[PDB]
């Protein structure tokens, strides 16, 4: 008799940090969501967004 009680049949991924923690940096791009920026060394630091209207 198969196991009747089950919570999740499939299997979760193995990437703990972010999506596609196995690919090389030349194949997959890095995420830019605020949840992933504050963890990266470059994105968590200062970022300027103010613009200038004319030359």
């Amino acid at each position: 008799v198969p196991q009747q009680l089950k919570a999740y049949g499939g299997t979760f991924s193995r990437s703990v940090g972010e999506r596609s923690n196995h690919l090389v940096s030349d194949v997959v791009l890095q995420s830019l969501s605020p949840s992933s920026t504050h963890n990266s060394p470059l994105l968590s630091k200062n970022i300027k967004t103010k613009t200038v209207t004319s030359f």
Binding site: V1, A7, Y8, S13, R19, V28
Partner: protein, 143 residues
């Protein structure tokens, strides 16, 4: 217009090819011929473009696109339970004796047991699965 004679296996090459044709608001077009091998990535990119999402984390490996992380599935499952909880309160009246059963199947968050090895024990603690199995077999061989 750019004609990708073969679908690139990664989003990095696709956007780099796509960038050349359209420059500074100029009208452009991309024709990417694909076969059965690039069927996975062409299915995600086509969906990523229709909903206007950034091509971040796109791969050709099918198991990579269908299997999510535990915490990411944790966030999505918590929202799916709430959306059913809102529709249950808004458009339904449940009796008193069914109040425990409705909230147990459509309104409560039930954590999994070791989601790392969830493919073996199904997410339910096997010490429970052993007690449940003793209830099935005792009434199966009795039948």
């Amino acid at each position: 217009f750019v004609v990708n004679f073969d679908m690139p296996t990664n989003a990095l090459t696709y956007l780099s090819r796509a960038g050349r044709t359209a420059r500074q608001g100029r009208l452009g077009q991309v024709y990417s011929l694909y076969t059965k091998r690039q069927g996975v990535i062409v299915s995600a990119v086509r969906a990523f473009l229709q909903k206007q999402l950034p091509l971040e984390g796109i791969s050709n490996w099918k198991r990579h696109m269908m299997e999510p992380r535990y915490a990411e599935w944790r966030t999505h499952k918590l929202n799916a339970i709430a959306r059913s909880y809102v529709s249950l309160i808004t458009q339904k009246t449940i009796p008193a004796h069914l109040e425990r059963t409705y909230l147990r199947h459509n309104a409560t968050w039930r954590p999994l047991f070791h989601p790392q090895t969830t493919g073996v024990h199904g997410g339910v603690p096997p010490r429970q699965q052993q007690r449940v199995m003793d209830a099935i077999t005792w009434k199966a061989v009795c039948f």
